[PDB]
From a paper:
The two monomers in the dimer are closely associated by hydrophobic interactions and hydrogen bonds involving 11 residues on each subunit. Gln 12 and Phe 126 lie close together, and their side-chains lie opposite their symmetry mates at the dimer interface. Met 36 (and its symmetry mate) contributes the largest contribution of buried surface area of any residue at the interface, becoming entirely sequestered from the bulk solvent. Two nearby balls of electron density were modelled as chloride ions, which would counter the repulsive charge on the two residues (SFigure 2). One chloride ion sits in a hydrophobic pocket formed by Phe 21, Phe 32 and Tyr 37; it comes within 3 Å of the side-chain of Asp 39, which also lies close to Arg 26 from the neighbouring molecule. Least-squares comparison of the dimer in the apo and liganded models gives a rmsd of 121 Cα atoms (residues 9–129) of 0.53 Å.
[name] is a recently described lectin, of uncertain biological function, isolated from mussels. Here we have shown the protein is a dimeric member of the well-known β-trefoil superfamily. [name] is the first lectin to be described that shows an exquisite selectivity for asialo-[name] over the closely related [name], suggesting it may well be a useful tool in ganglioside research, and especially in studies of NK cells, which are currently of enormous interest due to their central role in the control of cancer by the immune system.
Residue numbers in the entry:
A (entry chain B): 6 to 129
B (entry chain A): 4 to 129
Write the structure that this text describes.
Amino acid sequence: IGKCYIQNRENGGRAFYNLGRKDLGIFTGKMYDDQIWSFQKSDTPGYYTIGRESKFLQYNGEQVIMSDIEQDTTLWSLEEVPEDKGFYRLLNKVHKAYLDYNGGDLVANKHQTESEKWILFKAY
Amino acid sequence: VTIGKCYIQNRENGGRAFYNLGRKDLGIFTGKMYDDQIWSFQKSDTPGYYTIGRESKFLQYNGEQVIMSDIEQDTTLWSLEEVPEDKGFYRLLNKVHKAYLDYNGGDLVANKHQTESEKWILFKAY
Ligand SMILES: [Cl-]
Ligand SMILES: [Cl-]
């Protein structure tokens, strides 16, 4: 909870949002400050928002994007992965799809795949 | 300042220190997050210093190479130094040899001069 990095088990890459070029993605390598997110509990029990730069990570059924608006599609639940203690899938409430990656892009996927396992750890 | 099970990850490349007992393999890895990257960070017998342990062994520096130790020798004692412009990151300073935990390629090394590759974040594994 609070400021955190969001790192993928499969490749060690971290989600980032760069406001200076409006670039959302996943990056493997150096730990830049645009990889630091605000992970906050939402109004609805069991659901969270993932935010940077006054925007929220959302999935609109077509793309994973950043939203200025705290709307339904910004709600995510954590889903335990028993084989990998400390890792979670991030499941979008509205569209029931998992946060995933394809190359350097964040995507959503209803299938359960090895690239959907994330660890959220304190930035400071 | 995490105490207990943690990953030890480098700011410069996102790589994680690891020790695999079966393969007797110590290094840093920039790919997938495996179980053997989870360390036990504990307070030592001497205040101000910590041990860094896996598989009933301890990370040490003997003045030549960074290696594991079966026993908590003086060479297994490390202090934390905050990195001035990177809150959450630390240099790990070996007590006996005054050398900072560092890396070169896939290997852990130690260096007495402060450099850009010595910044570690120690984050809870669970
Ligand atoms: Cl960018
Ligand atoms: Cl980045």
